[PDB]
Write a protein that binds this DNA or RNA. Sequence first.
RNA 1: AUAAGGGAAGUCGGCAAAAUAGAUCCGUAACUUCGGGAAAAGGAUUGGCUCUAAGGGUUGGGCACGUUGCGGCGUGCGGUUAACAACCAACUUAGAACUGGUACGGACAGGGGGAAUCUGACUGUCUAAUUAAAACAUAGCAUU
RNA 2: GCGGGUAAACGGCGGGAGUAACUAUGACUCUCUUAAGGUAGCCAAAUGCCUCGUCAUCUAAUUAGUGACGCGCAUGAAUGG
RNA 3: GUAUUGGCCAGCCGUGGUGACAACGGGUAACGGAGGGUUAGGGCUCGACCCCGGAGAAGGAGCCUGAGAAACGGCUACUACA
RNA 4: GGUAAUUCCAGCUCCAAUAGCGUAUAUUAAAGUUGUUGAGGUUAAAAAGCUCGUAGUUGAACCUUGGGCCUAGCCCGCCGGUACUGGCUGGGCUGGGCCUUUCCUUCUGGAGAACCGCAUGCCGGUGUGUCGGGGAACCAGGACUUUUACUCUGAACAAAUUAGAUCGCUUAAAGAAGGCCUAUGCUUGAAUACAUUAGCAUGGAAUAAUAGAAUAGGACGUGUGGUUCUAUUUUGUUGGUUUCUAGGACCGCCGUAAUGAUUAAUAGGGACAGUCGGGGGCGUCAGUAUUCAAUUGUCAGAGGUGAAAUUCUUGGAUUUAUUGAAGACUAACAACUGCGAAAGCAUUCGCCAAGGAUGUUUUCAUUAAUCAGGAACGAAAGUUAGGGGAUCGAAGACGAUCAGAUACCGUCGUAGUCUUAACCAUAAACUAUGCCGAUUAGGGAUCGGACGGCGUUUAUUUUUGACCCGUUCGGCACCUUACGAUAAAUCAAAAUGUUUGGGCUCCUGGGGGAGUAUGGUCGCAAGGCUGAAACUUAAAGAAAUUG
RNA 5: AAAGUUAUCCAAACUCGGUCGUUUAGAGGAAGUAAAAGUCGUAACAAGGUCUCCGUAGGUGAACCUGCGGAGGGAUCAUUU
Lengths: 129, 142, 150
Amino acid sequence: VRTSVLHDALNSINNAEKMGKRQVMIRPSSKVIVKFLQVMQRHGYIGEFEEVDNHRSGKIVVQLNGRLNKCGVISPRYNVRLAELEKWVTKLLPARQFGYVILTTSAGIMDHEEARRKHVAGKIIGFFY
Amino acid sequence: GGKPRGLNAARKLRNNRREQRWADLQYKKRALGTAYKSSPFGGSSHAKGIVLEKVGVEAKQPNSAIRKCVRVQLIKNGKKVTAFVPNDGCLNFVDENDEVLLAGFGRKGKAKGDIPGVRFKVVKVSGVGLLALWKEKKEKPR
Amino acid sequence: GRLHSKGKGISASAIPYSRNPPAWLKTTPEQVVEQICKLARKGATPSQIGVILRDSHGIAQVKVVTGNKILRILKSNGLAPDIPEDLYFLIKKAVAVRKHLERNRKDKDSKFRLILIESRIHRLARYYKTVGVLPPTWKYESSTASTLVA
RNA sequence: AUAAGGGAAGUCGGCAAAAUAGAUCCGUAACUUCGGGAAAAGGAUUGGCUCUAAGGGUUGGGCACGUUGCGGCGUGCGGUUAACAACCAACUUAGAACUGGUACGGACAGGGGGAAUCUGACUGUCUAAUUAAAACAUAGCAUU
RNA sequence: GCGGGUAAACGGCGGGAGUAACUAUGACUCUCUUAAGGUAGCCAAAUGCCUCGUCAUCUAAUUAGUGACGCGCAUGAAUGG
RNA sequence: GUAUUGGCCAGCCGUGGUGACAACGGGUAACGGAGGGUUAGGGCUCGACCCCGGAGAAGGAGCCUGAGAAACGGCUACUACA
RNA sequence: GGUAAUUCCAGCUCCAAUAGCGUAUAUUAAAGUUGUUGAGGUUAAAAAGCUCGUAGUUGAACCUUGGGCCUAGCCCGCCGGUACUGGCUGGGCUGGGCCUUUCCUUCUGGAGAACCGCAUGCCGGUGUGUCGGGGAACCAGGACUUUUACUCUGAACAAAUUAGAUCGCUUAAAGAAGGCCUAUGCUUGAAUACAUUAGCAUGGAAUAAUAGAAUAGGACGUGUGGUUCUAUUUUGUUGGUUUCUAGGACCGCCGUAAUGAUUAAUAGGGACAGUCGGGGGCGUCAGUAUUCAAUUGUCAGAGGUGAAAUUCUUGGAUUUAUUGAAGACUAACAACUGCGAAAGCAUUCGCCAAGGAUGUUUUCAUUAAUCAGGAACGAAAGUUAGGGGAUCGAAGACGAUCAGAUACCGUCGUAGUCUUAACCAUAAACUAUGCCGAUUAGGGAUCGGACGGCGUUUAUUUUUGACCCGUUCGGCACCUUACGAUAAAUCAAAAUGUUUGGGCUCCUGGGGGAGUAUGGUCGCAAGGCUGAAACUUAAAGAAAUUG
RNA sequence: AAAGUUAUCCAAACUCGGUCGUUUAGAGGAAGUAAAAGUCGUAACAAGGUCUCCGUAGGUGAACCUGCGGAGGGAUCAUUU
Ligand SMILES: [Mg+2]
Ligand SMILES: [Mg+2]
Ligand SMILES: [Mg+2]
Ligand SMILES: [Mg+2]
Ligand SMILES: [Mg+2]
Ligand SMILES: [Mg+2]
Ligand SMILES: [Mg+2]
Ligand SMILES: [Mg+2]
Ligand SMILES: [Mg+2]
Ligand SMILES: [Mg+2]
Ligand SMILES: [Mg+2]
Ligand SMILES: [Mg+2]
Ligand SMILES: [Mg+2]
Ligand SMILES: [Mg+2]
Ligand SMILES: [Mg+2]
Ligand SMILES: [Mg+2]
Ligand SMILES: [Mg+2]
Ligand SMILES: [Mg+2]
Ligand SMILES: [Mg+2]
Ligand SMILES: [Mg+2]
Ligand SMILES: [Mg+2]
Ligand SMILES: [Mg+2]
Ligand SMILES: [Mg+2]
Ligand SMILES: [Mg+2]
Ligand SMILES: [Mg+2]
Ligand SMILES: [Mg+2]
Ligand SMILES: [Mg+2]
Ligand SMILES: [Mg+2]
Ligand SMILES: [Mg+2]
Ligand SMILES: [Mg+2]
Ligand SMILES: [Mg+2]
Ligand SMILES: [Mg+2]
Ligand SMILES: [Mg+2]
Ligand SMILES: [Mg+2]
Ligand SMILES: [Mg+2]
Ligand SMILES: [Mg+2]
Ligand SMILES: [Mg+2]
Ligand SMILES: [Mg+2]
Ligand SMILES: [Mg+2]
Ligand SMILES: [Mg+2]
Ligand SMILES: [Mg+2]
Ligand SMILES: [Mg+2]
Ligand SMILES: [Mg+2]
Ligand SMILES: [Mg+2]
Ligand SMILES: [Mg+2]
Ligand SMILES: [Mg+2]
Ligand SMILES: [Mg+2]
Ligand SMILES: [Mg+2]
Ligand SMILES: [Mg+2]
Ligand SMILES: [Mg+2]
Ligand SMILES: [Mg+2]
Ligand SMILES: [Mg+2]
Ligand SMILES: [Mg+2]
Ligand SMILES: [Mg+2]
Ligand SMILES: [Mg+2]
Ligand SMILES: [Mg+2]
Ligand SMILES: [Mg+2]
Ligand SMILES: [Mg+2]
Ligand SMILES: [Mg+2]
Ligand SMILES: [Mg+2]
Ligand SMILES: [Mg+2]
Ligand SMILES: [Mg+2]
Ligand SMILES: [Mg+2]
Ligand SMILES: [Mg+2]
Ligand SMILES: [Mg+2]
Ligand SMILES: [Mg+2]
Ligand SMILES: [Mg+2]
Ligand SMILES: [Mg+2]
Ligand SMILES: [Mg+2]
Ligand SMILES: [Mg+2]
Ligand SMILES: [Mg+2]
Ligand SMILES: [Mg+2]
Ligand SMILES: [Mg+2]
Ligand SMILES: [Mg+2]
Ligand SMILES: [Mg+2]
Ligand SMILES: [Mg+2]
Ligand SMILES: [Mg+2]
Ligand SMILES: [Mg+2]
Ligand SMILES: [Mg+2]
Ligand SMILES: [Mg+2]
Ligand SMILES: [Mg+2]
Ligand SMILES: [Mg+2]
Ligand SMILES: [Mg+2]
Ligand SMILES: [Mg+2]
Ligand SMILES: [Mg+2]
Ligand SMILES: [Mg+2]
């Protein structure tokens, strides 16, 4: 059964982009999904997205503009200290100059670079580059 | 594929690795301690014994020669084994009742080369060392 | 797909987006409640109380007209059944299989069905006990189950 | 009927005799048709006297009216004695102290046991007056 | 009389020669022969003459006892194994 | 009874305690730890041995003196050696 | 290495490390050959025969967001001046205040400010004072606050060791020393970080769980009544008694309020409607054929094979027509078609309970996914008791073939083949491919349900049914293609995997010994499930290419 | 106030029996691996000359043969009213 709505959204986005399409549809919509898209949007990796409102859960239609290589999710949301955050960027990021690792903390979800500025840590939920 | 992946499944993963670890052959012989029990040497590197007789052993099929081994009974536990005397014309240095010292071929319990059923070689005889006698660096005591 | 099967059908009902009664209904919520209680006293369970209202005259959704579900209305009027109807129908089917089975001793297929039905009853009864609908000591005894149905 | 030391060296052969034995508490193998084997094998305790504890039966229960020779009923009720009080009656079980020439199922009564082979499955029956058995019978199975 | 059936009916169920890189043994082959040539099992057994058979065990010493071996004078399948 | 608590022990009365989240039992060529060796990260393996804690003085038990010992370069007895 | 040895035994020459170098055993890297990061399971080692279900692991969405002002601290850009200094209505980063329906619990006490006026003094500000309207903030004390995990910062915690700062022991491994003019003197160092699980405090409030008002046994009030317990100092002192007051527990009456219930998942269960199928059980009906038997006609061969023989026959075989009995089996229609959890299921009709898909503006509201042990069913052969016993036919007996033929071929034939009541639990039980969910490409056929449409056919005829065109949900399959995958054969999954994480169970680690020995457990037995070690070996094996 | 003495408690040590673990002798029986210029056949790989294999049952000097139900890893992806 559906055990991770976030994985379904990120997987569906990756498939359409890899095939060269321009738009995607996501069947279930949640707060974590929208907060994940907003982080990607502010860095220019996607465009506008719109949330149609059926009374059950709503859908999302995202607009693609290339520039996106992969967007994945880590299924067991591990606990990561602030001191060991550099282990992860060495693992699942192509290079040190660019790329973002998404965390969830008590101060909202944010990428791995803003968390360093605010000096906050938490749980890891995904990545995109 | 097919592993448990949840955040509270540390018990299943630890138990599974312990069970499947026995299929390894190197680890299985370490855990059961077969060397301490079955090996003629008590898990040691060398051993001393007494020579009983001189035996010639035929080489395997592609080759053709006589390997000129020797029979020895271990002092430590009374077991009987056969050992190979290396180099050319070295049986003339091992008489009867000579207190030889042995070692392995380095294949860790398997026969080396074309010699069948031989796992040890003579290192010293009468406490002089075989190779030193071969190059005439010493004279065998009487 | 299915609880005990391999089918994967998707047949269901689609609820309209609108949450307001149509302009041609012209029936008060109070009249609907009195209509519900008459049918419940005649013996109907909530299942076909709704379908009678929908097919015969008027109401398509009881919730939109009155703001409450059918079972909730009946409970406040002291008309709720002693055991839930969904569990009641499962018990009724299990009794009929046992009665047929004892006459046909070597019907090996019907024996398989009885294990599935009873296994479905135990799962459903556990949920009702942990929510408070049924007393914690309630047990499905095959011997005395025939009295509950009728 | 009893015998020092030895304990089957006797004899066709342990034939005759000896040893074991009641009750309470521990303990119990191979094999097996799972019912048995089993009282397997092998150990401990036992008197007298002075005490302690447990196991039962019967009759009694508060006011308010009415009848009647201190009360038996008519009733009208209420209460459940945080189970008390008097009286009556046989035996069976467990525990402690003291005591003796260490003895005590003190006479009577009262299983020797274990490892294996041959043979008939078992209980049962027969040569009265030399043979009780491996012989006969038996359930089960098969044929006319 | 001629011709069929029937063994949980009465009963029956074999000899001689050669042959494997030492010796021994004989899976294999030729040969005589009829109703069929003893199969599964078991054994010096209450059934074995030669016999106190040969090997092991039990004893200081055992024609006895038990466990094995089997060309078995003359074991053997409801004459039941 | 002990320096004191305690089923540590003696009487009387209840029927409990542990277990698939691995009890109970068997193996250990097992004293525990700080730590040694080998390394991308994650690990695998060893630790009698100079520092800290525990135990023993051939094998078992008992005790004297003393603030402190069930002591062995203290005593008594049995077993084994001499 | 078998007569010209680049490999043995020797002399020359040369190579590697060097005061050191070789051998044996243990252990780590190499090993992504133990795989949480990170490993195979269609054919190379390996998905339980199949379904139900408890521990265990894992579980859909939803509750205060946004906006509008003010202010600080750190960088960068720019300008100008001498690393210094100032400026930009500089653009950013981190943080703190206010108004938007929200902002921040409460009482006692301490000390005391800002803002205020009073008069007393200098050149419209100020010490003024035991001045008072007044307490920003702060400290101490009391009461109230759903509960865990997680992360941040603190506290507490060993020396040596590991990382690491300082100082030329002549350098170094070390050491904790030393330095300055010359001094009858001065001066310094012996830092810092890490552990990390558990326990004690602090800030944050996302993510994952948890608690609350539904038979109101609910919240609030200086509203208003009750009955119970406790009693500080004030009336001299002690004792006794009473009122008021203060506090606690509990129960009414009245009032106040927007008075208290999230969706209805292309998650799941249940109800209802018209259907569909060789799904299961009991009973019953029919069909020709095979074998036997009775009646009937005729006359010499019939059978069987590559070719023959054994066998049957004028005691009339084989062949021909009519009739009867018995047991087994359901031809053709029958297919890249249907149903069932799998094993499996095909003649008619009656009875009995069950199931999938489709249709639906019915109902419940997370009731779900997968499962160690445990349980139901499980072809054929085989086992125990009765019935039945046509046909085929293990064992067995003969005829040929052959050098031999205990076989292939031919004539006979027992158990068995069928049924009722009980056991057995294994198959190449196969798609050699576990189950749930999401996404990814074109095409035409077909089975079941619904919806739309022009006609033809046809009936006591319309609506329905048969045929034709199109859409859609659910199934058994197939054709093309490769952006993708694989060692390859090939695959719409065997794809979305070095750019590696959606959830869950089982199994495998070079070839033999070996699914064997032994112990345990189930079975009447045959046997099933569980399952080693000694020893031995450098290759077994998979897909494809040329001969 | 010493020797001695009465009754409990803590108890080494020895004797007999039970039970568990490790090591080891044994007539005879039945397997595996290797080494061979051995004897008898030819089961498998080509339609291996009877297509091969799987579960089960019986039989034979030996490989193997035969019955019943499966599978293609086959020697057929295929035959029309
Ligand atoms: Mg290995
Ligand atoms: Mg679905
Ligand atoms: Mg399920
Ligand atoms: Mg299912
Ligand atoms: Mg005497
Ligand atoms: Mg005497
Ligand atoms: Mg005696
Ligand atoms: Mg005698
Ligand atoms: Mg006699
Ligand atoms: Mg006698
Ligand atoms: Mg007597
Ligand atoms: Mg008994
Ligand atoms: Mg007894
Ligand atoms: Mg006795
Ligand atoms: Mg006995
Ligand atoms: Mg007494
Ligand atoms: Mg006695
Ligand atoms: Mg006596
Ligand atoms: Mg008898
Ligand atoms: Mg007589
Ligand atoms: Mg007599
Ligand atoms: Mg010969
Ligand atoms: Mg014989
Ligand atoms: Mg004999
Ligand atoms: Mg004899
Ligand atoms: Mg005899
Ligand atoms: Mg016998
Ligand atoms: Mg004799
Ligand atoms: Mg004898
Ligand atoms: Mg004798
Ligand atoms: Mg004998
Ligand atoms: Mg005879
Ligand atoms: Mg006979
Ligand atoms: Mg006889
Ligand atoms: Mg319990
Ligand atoms: Mg250790
Ligand atoms: Mg030790
Ligand atoms: Mg140590
Ligand atoms: Mg040691
Ligand atoms: Mg050392
Ligand atoms: Mg010593
Ligand atoms: Mg002192
Ligand atoms: Mg000590
Ligand atoms: Mg001592
Ligand atoms: Mg000393
Ligand atoms: Mg000392
Ligand atoms: Mg020469
Ligand atoms: Mg030469
Ligand atoms: Mg030369
Ligand atoms: Mg691998
Ligand atoms: Mg395989
Ligand atoms: Mg399968
Ligand atoms: Mg959730
Ligand atoms: Mg240094
Ligand atoms: Mg905290
Ligand atoms: Mg729904
Ligand atoms: Mg049917
Ligand atoms: Mg016939
Ligand atoms: Mg005729
Ligand atoms: Mg018939
Ligand atoms: Mg069909
Ligand atoms: Mg038909
Ligand atoms: Mg299981
Ligand atoms: Mg069957
Ligand atoms: Mg059968
Ligand atoms: Mg019978
Ligand atoms: Mg029968
Ligand atoms: Mg036939
Ligand atoms: Mg035959
Ligand atoms: Mg199998
Ligand atoms: Mg399989
Ligand atoms: Mg398609
Ligand atoms: Mg078409
Ligand atoms: Mg259709
Ligand atoms: Mg239509
Ligand atoms: Mg379709
Ligand atoms: Mg289908
Ligand atoms: Mg890597
Ligand atoms: Mg076994
Ligand atoms: Mg080679
Ligand atoms: Mg090949
Ligand atoms: Mg032995
Ligand atoms: Mg032997
Ligand atoms: Mg063949
Ligand atoms: Mg073939
Ligand atoms: Mg092939």
